[PDB]
Amino acid sequence: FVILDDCNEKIDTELASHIVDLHMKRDEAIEPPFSAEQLRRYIKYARTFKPILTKEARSYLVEKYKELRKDDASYRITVRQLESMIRLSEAIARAN
Amino acid sequence: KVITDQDLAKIREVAAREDLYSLLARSIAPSIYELEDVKKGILLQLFGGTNKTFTKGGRYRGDINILLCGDPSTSKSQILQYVHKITPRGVYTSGKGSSAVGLTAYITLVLESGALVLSDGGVCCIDEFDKMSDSTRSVLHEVMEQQTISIAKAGIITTLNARSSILASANPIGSRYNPNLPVTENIDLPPPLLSRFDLVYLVLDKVDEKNDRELAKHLTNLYLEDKPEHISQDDVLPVEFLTMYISYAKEHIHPIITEAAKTELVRAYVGMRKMTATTRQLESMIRLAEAHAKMKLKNVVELEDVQEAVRLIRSAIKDYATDPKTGKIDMNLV
Ligand SMILES: Nc1ncnc2c1ncn2[C@@H]1O[C@H](COP(=O)(O)OP(=O)(O)NP(=O)(O)O)[C@@H](O)[C@H]1O
Numbered sequence: 142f143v144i145l146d147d148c149n150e151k152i153d154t155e156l157a158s159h160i161v162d163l164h165m166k167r168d169e170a171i172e173p174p175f176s177a178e179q180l181r182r183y184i185k186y187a188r189t190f191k192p193i194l195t196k197e198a199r200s201y202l203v204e205k206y207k208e209l210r211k212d213d214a215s216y217r218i219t220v221r222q223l224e225s226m227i228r229l230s231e232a233i234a235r236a237n
Numbered sequence: 238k239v240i241t242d243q244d245l246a247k248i249r250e251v252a253a254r255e256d257l258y259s260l261l262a263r264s265i266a267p268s269i270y271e272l273e274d275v276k277k278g279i280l281l282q283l284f285g286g287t288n289k290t291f292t293k294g295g296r297y298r299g300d301i302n303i304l305l306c307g308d309p310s311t312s313k314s315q316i317l318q319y320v321h322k323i324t325p326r327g328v329y330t331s332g333k334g335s336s337a338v339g340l341t342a343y344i345t346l347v348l349e350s351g352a353l354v355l356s357d358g359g360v361c362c363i364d365e366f367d368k369m370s371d372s373t374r375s376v377l378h379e380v381m382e383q384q385t386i387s388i389a390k391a392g393i394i395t396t397l398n399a400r401s402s403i404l405a406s407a408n409p410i411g412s413r414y415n416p417n418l419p420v421t422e423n424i425d426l427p428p429p430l431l432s433r434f435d436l437v438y439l440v441l442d443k444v445d446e447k448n449d450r451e452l453a454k455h456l457t458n459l460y461l462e463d464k465p466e467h468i469s470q471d472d473v474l475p476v477e478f479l480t481m482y483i484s485y486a487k488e489h490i491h492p493i494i495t496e497a498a499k500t501e502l503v504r505a506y507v508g509m510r511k512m513t514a515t516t517r518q519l520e521s522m523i524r525l526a527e528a529h530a531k532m533k534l535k536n537v538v539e540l541e542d543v544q545e546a547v548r549l550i551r552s553a554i555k556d557y558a559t560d561p562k563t564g565k566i567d568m569n570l571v
């Protein structure tokens with residue numbers, strides 16, 4: 142992941158407000174979707190799943206990998222990117 | 238170690254004076270001639286911001302870091318002496334005198350403390366900052382940003398607290414300020430480290446007969462007596478009472494942001510940003526405004542405090558005299 146400043150008034154005006162709110166109110170600003178002790182229980186539950194790759198997904202993966210190889214034809218895209226993509230898909234299915 | 242209602246009466250009465258900000262600033266280092274903005278910035282470092290801790294989302298530093306940069310003979314190191322003696326806890330050190338281990342912590346199986354750890358809650362004065370190597374200076378990134386020291390070596394792995402304020406002194410590349418280079422190239426610190434200072438000062442050895450006669454009369458007056466009674470100004474506070482004021486204000490006063498101050502801070506940041514100002518310029522402005530509020534024994538940050546914080550930042554780095562496009566300074570405007 143590469144992070145860059147990308148200066149823009151419409152973003153700066155909001156980001157400054159967010160930062161000043163954090164210094165103005167301690168706890169109140171964030172309002173997260175879930176409690177931390179709720180989220181950890183969910184993550185513990187999710188890690189019990191061991192999902193399996195569907196037939197259509199196997200057909201689809203090689204097409205997407207061919208697209209990456211043609212984009213590649215910047216770090217050069219190897220077989221390892223397919224293995225990594227499978228790992229990410231396993232994690233996504235587990236999240237759900 | 239080396240309260241009464243009368244003390245509180247004196248403190249409250251002094252805090253009501255109109256010339257308070259100038260009185261306090263010119264009284265931290267009485268025998269040093271002018272350099273008022275430098276003295277003001279150092280005073281606000283002494284007071285500090287407010288410390289903040291959340292239930293989640295972390296903790297935010299109250300401490301201010303300052304860098305003094307400019308020509309030789311300008312009396313930078315003399316100012317560091319006063320700060321080193323005023324502060325209750327702190328250390329003075331030199332660039333060629335310091336190793337990475339000595340500055341933080343030492344394996345000896347037992348762990349041992351370095352300068353930034355001994356200086357916790359105080360001010361750490363570093364002189365000849367431009368002489369120490371990139372290897373040694375890289376240690377300061379983590380301690381300045383987080384105020385913690387993480388260690389992972391054979392048989393010991395831990396994290397330590399370092400609520401330490403840095404006051405630094407350096408001379409530019411080429412050893413005298415060169416007006417044919419932009420300011421960032423004269424200062425020559427890398428951007429990840431230069432971004433971590435709240436205030437950066439340029440001080441310049443500009444020739445002027447008006448200035449020179451006053452300076453010469455001031456320094457020669459010290460030799461008219463064996464042990465001088467002479468002092469630069471008629472009204473200054475004794476060191477003991479000044480210490481009492483600063484200590485009490487640090488303990489009892491805790492300012493908060495007002496909505497008006499929030500609006501001005503957002504406006505001012507967008508003004509400096511739209512044109513380079515980073516996100517740290519916002520947080521340092523908040524911290525300076527809080528330090529200004531404590532110094533008046535107020536419980537709230539107001540519009541006046543925000544505007545003083547902005548003004549001092551613009552004044553320190555000679556921005557008004559800076560060419561906005563080329564980054565060089567017109568020496569005629571100084
Ligand atoms: N405004 C001033 N007020 C008082 N003394 C001054 C002033 N300007 C210069 N001096 C004197 O000039 C000398 C400055 O020495 P010093 O404090 O080392 O300056 P410096 O900024 O650290 N220069 P350098 O170490 O070469 O980078 C001391 O003797 C001071 O007393």
Ligand SMILES: [Mg+2]
Nearest residue numbers: 312313314315
């Ligand atoms: Mg010196």
